[PDB]
Amino acid sequence: VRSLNSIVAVCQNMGIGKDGNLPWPPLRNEYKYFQRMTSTSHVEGKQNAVIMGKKTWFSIPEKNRPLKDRINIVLSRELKEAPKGAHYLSKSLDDALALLDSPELKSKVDMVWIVGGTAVYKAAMEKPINHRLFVTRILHEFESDTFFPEIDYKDFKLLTEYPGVPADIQEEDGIQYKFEVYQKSV
Ligand SMILES: NC(=S)c1ccc[n+]([C@@H]2O[C@H](COP(=O)([O-])OP(=O)(O)OC[C@H]3O[C@@H](n4cnc5c(N)ncnc54)[C@H](OP(=O)(O)O)[C@@H]3O)[C@@H](O)[C@H]2O)c1
Ligand SMILES: C[C@H](O)[C@H](O)C1=Nc2c(nc(N)[nH]c2=O)NC1
Ligand SMILES: [Ca+2]
């Protein structure tokens, strides 16, 4: 595939989850951002693909599965078949990448988004391919049991601006956050 996109929300301690959920209570606007970025294809007749770990998949309320308007691919070394509602199951990122290139998919897919968790982000980060990381930095700390892997600031250059991404510090529910885009060129 040409390039990857990863999206995540992190707090000050780099936590991304706690007890099978997000460490903070609901933020409406941040959520809509994720929906908008992951769902928006720039080609008619094509849809985006989202890739995610098993834990992540099960974290989404069942009635909300699969994420509407995207091809959901779950990764698992243990499952035998895609969980009820997922489009495809893959045993590794590589496998997932190959499937995407498959003829049946290739023409059906616009963008590939990596939606975590940890191991998923890590794996994608290490692929020597063009990659854009969309980070929402929540400017507070919350107790977390799961964390975002360390990004190589030598590879991933923070962009100072990106089309459609608000620049300023945002606030909602008394919480401040900022959007940042990092880009790796291969
Ligand atoms: N802040 C944001 S935006 C965000 C985004 C995603 C998740 N979360 C949170 O983080 C937690 C879920 O994340 P996590 O890191 O614990 O779990 P996940 O990555 O979602 O799930 C882990 C499992 O997925 C499979 N897997 C993961 N990476 C794999 C790979 N490269 N190849 C094959 N299978 C792989 C394995 O399943 P098997 O054991 O079956 O092999 C592994 O046990 C929840 O609290 C969720 O809310 C937060
Ligand atoms: C995909 C699943 O809902 C998951 O927890 C994710 N949540 C978010 C995300 N990305 C952002 N920006 N915000 C979220 O709430 N990526 C993944
Ligand atoms: Ca396991």
| Total domains in the fold of the chain | 1
Catalytic residue among 30, 75, 93, 133: 30
Resolution in A: 2.3
Which residues face 133 on adjacent strands? 6, 182
The minimum-distance atom of ligand 1 relative to the CA of 90 is 33
The approach used to solve this structure was X-ray
Contact 131, 1 (CB under 8 A): no
Q: Is the dihedral of CA 163, 165, 169, 171 positive or negative?
A: positive
Ligand 2 and 89: CB distance under 6 A: no
Question: Which domain does 7 fall in, by range?
Answer: 1-186
Q: At what angle do helices 93-101 and 118-126 cross, to 10 degrees?
A: 60
Looking at residue 156, which CATH number applies to its domain?
3.40.430.10
Give the integer Cα–Cα distance in Å for 62 and 45.
Answer: 27
Give the integer Cα–Cα distance in Å for 124 and 78.
Answer: 20
CB environment 12-41: b (16+ within 10 A), e (fewer): eebbbbeeeebbbeebeebeebbeebbbee
Q: What is the DSSP secondary structure assignment for residue 106, as one 8-state letter?
A: H
Tell which phi-psi region holds residue 52, choosing left (phi > 0), alpha (psi between -120 and 50) or beta.
beta
How many whole angstroms from 4 Cα to the centroid of ligand 2? 16
Q: What is the 3-state secondary structure (H, E, C) of 49-105?
A: EEEEEHHHHHHCCHHHCCCCCEEEEEECCCCCCCCCCCCEEECCHHHHHHHHHCHHH
